[PDB]
Structure 1
């Protein structure tokens, strides 16, 4: 029945208002492969709103590995990994990820989102604590809500606040600190050296979400612990396959005893169907390309350094990025929606960040680089951004 349900959704008017004003630019229906240019409404649009940092979703080798796994294994496994949904190729990918991030063992999940739900829901229980950076990804907040532990947020990269909040907790309790590695909003890196120093002093477990770090920082792209030399001080390395690795799924890697506990206790792996064969094979062949062909990471950072220097030279107000995510502050929700749509209508795709996710005065667009971008495409996007920011009077 719908009376009360209709009242619950009655106040949600922003989408209706964006559509009516001709500003709506969510769920834009792309008609072609994710690439540096995409087709939308039959026209070609420069893609600066992707997470495909290495441009690998179009690599013919990765496509053919996926098509070959469909031929051999079919369209799906039709069960959880726990029961009838494990393939030899899942186990292979776990072994190859464990080697890549320097851990004993790993467990796959069908999404990156579920990869955070698993360890955060089942390791800390009644009378324990989870400590979260306040800017952690939604999946980490949600995984923490699924625990029976007390969840405590600390100020963004605020090591004194983390240390003070830990200090206060009962000694006779377990604690787990979970942080993004690269934070996607502003593209900043966690202070892993200080965080791990604090964790060691309070015997707290450390879990890093390397969604935006794998294929981006660390030796041969191995992530945030690799970037800082702190493999031994991070208990759990989580990553996703939906970004540099051009696929869908994720994993958690760590000590074999912890991973054995997770794979038999995490509801998001016991009660959800396994990764498709095609995604296991695409992730495996992306992982072998990222390591064997250093040119992809190198070109990503050439593009990042070039675009960042060009945006600063034009006087754009950038956030504190240390990644291929270039956050461009606008500081008005209305202007952020207008700039986003004006750019779309001039063939440039960027992602808006608005209220209620952030305060109006912190609203921005996110301009992300791919290894496969050209300097010409970067130049075209930035000269269109200059024109739209003028038209908008930012």
Structure 2
């Protein structure tokens, strides 16, 4: 019945207002492969709003691997990994990932999102604590909310606040610190040396979410622990396959005993169907290419360094990024919606960040690089961005 339900949703008017003003640009229907140009409403649009950092969703070898796995294994496994949903190729990908990030063992999940729900829900329990950077991904706050532990946020990369909040807790309790490796909003890197120093002092477990780090930082893209040389101070490396790895799903890697506990206790792996064969095979073939072909990571960073330099030279106000995410400040929700739509209509795709996710005065567009971007594409997008910022009086 819908009386109270209708009242619950009644005050959500922003989408109605965006659509009526001709500003709405969510769920834009793409007609073509995710690439540096995408087709929307039959017209070409430059894509600077993607997480495919190495451009690999169009790699014909990765497409063929997926198509061959469909031929051999069909369209789905129709069960949890736990029961009838494990293939030899899931185990192969777990062994490959473990080697890549330098851990004993891994367990796959069918999404990145569920890869955080798993360890955050089932390791810390009653009388235990989870310590979260206040900017952690939504999936980390949700995972932590599914635990029976007490969840404590600390100031963004604030090691004094992390240390202070740990020092307050009972000794006879378990603690886990979970952080994004690269934080996607501003593109900044966790202070992993100080966080792990503090974790070592308080015997707290450390988990790093490397969604935006894999294929981006660390040796051959192996992530944030790899970037800092701190493999031995990180208990759990979590990653996703939806970004550099051009696919769908994720994993948690760590010590064999911890991963054995996880794979038999995490509701998001016991009670959800396993990755499709096609996604296993695309992830396996992408992981080979990231390691075998250093040019992908090199070109990503040459694009990043070029675009960042060009944006700062044209006088854009950038966030404190250390990554291929170039956050461009606008500091008005209205102007952020206007700039986003005007760029869309001029053939540039960027992502808006607005209230209530950030303060009005911190509203921004996110401009992300792919290895497959050309300097010509970057220049065309920045040319169009300068024009639209002028038109919008930012």
**Could you tell me the TM-score, scaled by structure 1's length?**
1.00
Question: Which residue number corresponds to residue 376 of structure 1?
Answer: 376
Q: CA deviation at 1:389?
A: 0.2
Q: Which whole-Å deviations, capped at 9, do the CAs of 1:159-210 have from their partners, x for residues lacking one?
A: 0000000000000000000000000000000000000000000000000000
Q: CA deviation at 1:295?
A: 0.1
Q: What is the rounded CA distance, in whole Å, between the counterparts of 2:16 and 2:393 in structure 1? A: 25
Q: Which whole-Å deviations, capped at 9, do the CAs of 1:111-161 have from their partners, x for residues lacking one?
A: 000000000000000000000000000000000000000000000000000
The alignment partner of 1:120 has SS state of: helix
Q: What is the rounded CA distance, in whole Å, between the counterparts of 1:187 and 1:43 in structure 2? A: 30
Q: CA deviation at 1:362?
A: 0.2
Q: What is the rounded CA distance, in whole Å, between the counterparts of 1:390 and 1:162 in structure 2? A: 42
Q: What is the rounded CA distance, in whole Å, between the counterparts of 1:280 and 1:103 in structure 2? A: 19
Q: CA deviation at 1:338?
A: 0.1
The alignment partner of 1:6 has SS state of: helix
Q: What is the rounded CA distance, in whole Å, between the counterparts of 1:26 and 1:157 in structure 2? A: 30
The alignment partner of 2:96 has SS state of: helix
Q: Which whole-Å deviations, capped at 9, do the CAs of 1:270-290 have from their partners, x for residues lacking one?
A: 000000000000000000000
Q: What is the rounded CA distance, in whole Å, between the counterparts of 1:373 and 1:31 in structure 2? A: 19
Q: CA deviation at 1:372?
A: 0.0
Q: CA deviation at 1:348?
A: 0.1
Q: What is the rounded CA distance, in whole Å, between the counterparts of 1:357 and 1:320 in structure 2? A: 18
Q: Which whole-Å deviations, capped at 9, do the CAs of 1:78-116 have from their partners, x for residues lacking one?
A: 000000000000000000000000000000000000000
Q: Which whole-Å deviations, capped at 9, do the CAs of 1:309-365 have from their partners, x for residues lacking one?
A: 000000000000000000000000000000000000000000000000000000000
The alignment partner of 2:365 has SS state of: strand
Moved over 4 A (4+): none
Q: CA deviation at 1:54?
A: 0.1
Q: Which runs of 5+ in 2 are unaligned?
A: none
Q: What is the rounded CA distance, in whole Å, between the counterparts of 2:36 and 2:110 in structure 1? A: 26
Q: CA deviation at 1:14?
A: 0.2
Question: Which residue number corresponds to residue 236 of structure 1?
Answer: 236
Q: Which whole-Å deviations, capped at 9, do the CAs of 1:288-319 have from their partners, x for residues lacking one?
A: 00000000000000000000000000000000
Q: CA deviation at 1:388?
A: 0.2
The alignment partner of 2:93 has SS state of: helix
Q: Which runs of 5+ in 1 are unaligned?
A: none
TM-align CA RMSD: 0.1
**Could you tell me the TM-score, scaled by structure 2's length?**
1.00
Q: What is the rounded CA distance, in whole Å, between the counterparts of 2:383 and 2:190 in structure 1? A: 32
The alignment partner of 1:135 has SS state of: coil
Question: Which residue number corresponds to residue 8 of structure 2?
Answer: 8
Q: CA deviation at 1:58?
A: 0.0
Q: What is the rounded CA distance, in whole Å, between the counterparts of 2:197 and 2:393 in structure 1? A: 46
Paired residue total: 394
Q: What is the rounded CA distance, in whole Å, between the counterparts of 1:195 and 1:385 in structure 2? A: 38
Q: CA deviation at 1:250?
A: 0.0
